[PDB]
């Protein structure tokens, strides 16, 4: 009727336990919401001592061989002349870290894939609620008899007890480990200081919409309405009334790509300027400079194009002294700030109309509406859960051009006390004129960030991490400390084959 | 008194974590509500020492 | 803050360093059963499924 | 810790078995897709011997008392002076019918409600697939030892074993019975004749859209496009060319509410007509008359309004003889049929874009789009399942004005061989100028259907029943035979109270 | 000649001709255990059935000729289903279990 | 079936 399937055992067999140590994460507080990869996108480890506070690890026999090239493991027996393999399962020992707790969960469903719900569920509170979790308290939160938790993991259900050629099974992922950094004793407070409210900086959506960033070859205009274009001007003027400011006081913005402040027409003789054309090229200010970004010195928004001001200057330079913001062409001169600061409270968030997506930063397209991938839009979770691991899910999905400079993250949230229709979160470093992860003693970008000084995901990273840190379970890590976690693994294999050849050494010239 | 059991039954354990208080010294004598009178969390990291 | 300071003069009231927030939590598990007549259900194509 | 709840038994108790017979359905073939109510909408039993091929019955102690007023049951003990009741459950005996099989299923979930999925699941093939069905073969399809199937049904889970006042429990529904008429031996063929394809008649959607029906006080126009109105004219002319027909040949349509054919201008002297105004009022034809409905005699569609023809006649009656359909104002004279016949095949139906809903017939609103209740739209089932019991779900829902004359049923189906964007199914009786359920020897509506002679659900009923009859499991019933099913019930009660009073009869004047 | 596959069973579910007792939406593995068939007596006509589960599926000229009612009725491992007219039975169907290919 |  029905028979057991039977295999004939190979002529020679050799047990091998691939034993070693795996880093689960190594994190600072400003990287807790990001995925730790030990083998990097080459910018990440530059001036960061830890890359991420959660990871997803896939282990395969080829990845175990790659860890042997790093000297991170031993093979108890070589496989050089036995081409068959018979995988029997794994032992893991998870160690208590000194300073940080952490949740683990693992899977062996042979089908390997990533999901948006998986990356959100890595959030420490959500992962801690899941079934078949393992919680590892730090040595500080619990002293234990054994300093580790040990468990045995069976092969994937698709990996049967049969022999397989090592070439076939080499790349088959035989284990997934998911880990997130946690605190049990600071679960609600986390790293909160003063109020429960966190402050988010954003680009004013009602004025900054053109997304025409990162060229010195283009005069910047902030919005289009109907057929019009609208333009921004800086001034150092002490004038109280927007009407009486001169046509000279304004510092027009003809670049977005640089950190440069520009300078006033009163410095014409310092830069040997002969015309308003040379004032435009030498003296124009980038709107995202540390004083213009929050209008520390006043910034003026208008329909009046710099080329209408060029016509007024070039028609007569002597009447450029006389002309004020009164009686100009299309004079919608107002006082507008490129940045607004919102307050977010996680306990006041109900997730009824929350939303999150990426838009293309370096393209000639207007507005902030969800565009491109509509299946990548993440909706209907509280912002601290909605943002957690979402950028890394998008990067691992590879459906966008990979570089942080070419996209912006945009999110909708009803629950900030002030509002903007979308939010374009910006990090305090970009709002203060400094590189994405550079120490606050610095007051300029580094040369590669002095270039490309415009809104993009590279400058948003610390702000969305700060929103994720408002969520529960997120750990408190002192500045300059890196928290770490490790597992010791032992994968059990047998190697199978016909009997191999061997060689020998002379007796006289041997260990004396 | 006897009841007739319904046709299909499904056990559910609603499992979770509840904050009992979060407090500074200057809020110890006040009731902690996690869902606030909107001024309380403005520049206070903990709202009350009992609940 | 004055009536909190008067309450802090009373016994059992904790000492918390300035800038530290003390916290407490419980883990709960409420046990329920859900009852009814048998519900409807739906299914996914075999070819377009977990590969 | 915890105690059993206990009740103290009442002073006197009297068992009563309410025993009787319930009709589950009584049906002809042309009523199989409709719900049987024994207590009618007063038009339904007029010239129909059976009202429906499925039913949903709710039984309550008050409905059992109402069946006692019809003499359909006995109470084994009266309840007159014992106000408490203790319901113990029910016994049902379902009898084999002579000629028809039938599926039963029952429920006792105290919460009583109707659903669109419930009414569709009454379809005989779908009901026969359900769990906890009972199939009762006819005496013809299976001879049995016992001529009935017997089962005991427990009280609703909300009805506990406690005593209740009879006033409180009177209206609580203690049982639901769902029954549908079936054939096991003709499951696929059913009542099919010739081809597997069924023919559906419909109103051309591309020309008949104005829905301005049922007034003799309004000149009918079939569609609006842009600012225009379009109009229909009948003719008995033998003319082969649409250009050369006279302005006289056309029989303009100024009524939709009547069965009247109208007559040609050549009969001016038979109706003492003096003007085209009297020709319009006496001689205009209804477009749904038995020759105009399918254009058996030619029917002409045009942008040219009858009032432009009035201006041509009234300006000079002598040039009305001379004028033809050439050189008329806005002359889009074409040959269009108000009806088209589609072919539907149930095995060719994939239900990918199937849809069904009711629109208001007597309102001044253009077009056929789903309107009013968007939650009542029924979608994504094959048309024989999608239509089954859907009109009765809508009637029982009471979200529309109840009368069949005030709504039309509209459905979308990709799978007819010819197509129309929506379909407006019409019964062969309305396509042949006869009352909704009147025998084919008749060639006119009855007086109440001579009035209101316009598209509405009352004239659609046999067409959607015919589409449901294309579906599997639907029975074959010879014309003039009514199939029937019955159950015998026994509800078990106790009556409770303090001891009642009693009276006596003289011995001398007694049974001699 | 009918061939049945799990995809043909899904297509019959789109026609509402079957039920699935449990959905498969989030469990991608399958373990087929076999089939039960109940063949019903028709009212008016008798009929021969035979079935196969040789995983290799193909058609042949000899197969189509052997469908002739007299030839099919001579084959081994036939099932004959008399009509209700030609034989009244205790059970109105013939039931048998079929193992996987 | 039934409970106290």
Numbering used by the authors:
A (entry chain T), D (entry chain V): 48 to 559
B (entry chain U): 52 to 102
C (entry chain U): 509 to 559
E (entry chain 0): 103 to 203
F (entry chain Y): 48 to 51
Show sentences the authors wrote.
Anelloviruses are nonpathogenic viruses that comprise a major portion of the human virome. Our determination of the LY1 structure demonstrates that ORF1 encodes the capsid protein and that anelloviruses evolved a novel spike domain that extends around the 5-fold axis to form a crown structure. The particle, formed by 60 jelly roll domain-containing ANV capsid proteins, forms an icosahedral particle core from which spike domains extend to form a salient part of the particle surface. The base of the spike domain, the P1 subdomain, shares some sequence conservation between ANV strains while a hypervariable region, forming the P2 subdomain, is at the spike domain apex.
To generate a higher resolution structure, we generated an ORF1 polypeptide lacking the C-terminus (ΔC-Term) in human cells (Expi 293) and determined its structure. Western blot and Coomassie-stained sodium dodecyl-sulfate polyacrylamide gel electrophoresis (SDS-PAGE) analysis of the ΔC-Term ORF1 construct purified from mammalian cells showed a principal band consistent with the expected size. We determined the cryo-EM structure of the virus-like particles formed by the insect cell-derived ΔARM fragment to 3.9 Å resolution from 6271 particles and of the mammalian cell-derived LY1 ΔC-Term ORF1 particle using cryo-EM to 2.69 Å resolution from 22,743 particles. Particles from both expression systems adopt comparable folds, including an icosahedral particle core. Absent from both structures is the majority of the C-terminal region (in the higher resolution ΔC-Term particle, we see density up to residue 562). The portion of the C-terminus we can see extends from the jelly roll core toward the surface near the 2-fold axis between the spike domain crowns. The local resolution of P1 is only slightly lower than the jelly roll domain (~3–3.5 Å), while the resolution of P2 is within 4.5–5 Å.
